[PDB]
Amino acid sequence: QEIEGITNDTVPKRLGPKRANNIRKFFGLTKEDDVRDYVIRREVTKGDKSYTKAPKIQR
RNA sequence: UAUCUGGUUGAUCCUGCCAGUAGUCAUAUGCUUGUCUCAAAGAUUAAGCCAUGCAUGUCUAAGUAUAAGCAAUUUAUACAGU
Ligand SMILES: [Mg+2]
Ligand SMILES: [Mg+2]
Ligand SMILES: [Mg+2]
Ligand SMILES: [Mg+2]
Ligand SMILES: [Mg+2]
Ligand SMILES: [Mg+2]
């Protein structure tokens, strides 16, 4: 028996990987593939203006 | 910038203290008090107690920002502005 929303509904991860190695771990890409391509960008709205926030991929 | 006088007796000269005397960046306290300038101030009694508040935090082009923070527009879909 699934309890209301604890097992039924899911809350996603707040953050994505910050380190390049960590990023690689998240997908499984190997050295050649590079970063940039698979970064979790957040898109925030003030009210009318919609803008973007992206992680600084250290290392 | 080294100063003495009153008090022992009927008077005397002393020895002596006592009293005055002058000061204190030494306290208190009493009246009093308009003015500038400079300003000590719970040491002394109990290093006794303590309500409340404050008395140490710090960021630069240059350690760490996906603030679901602000910004917002004529460097971005890697970051690059506070
Ligand atoms: Mg770096
Ligand atoms: Mg005699
Ligand atoms: Mg006489
Ligand atoms: Mg005297
Ligand atoms: Mg005047
Ligand atoms: Mg005391």
UniProtKB/Swiss-Prot annotation:
Phosphorylated. Transmembrane segments: none annotated. Belongs to the eukaryotic ribosomal protein eS6 family. This is Small ribosomal subunit protein eS6. It comes from Kluyveromyces lactis (strain ATCC 8585 / CBS 2359 / DSM 70799 / NBRC 1267 / NRRL Y-1140 / WM37).
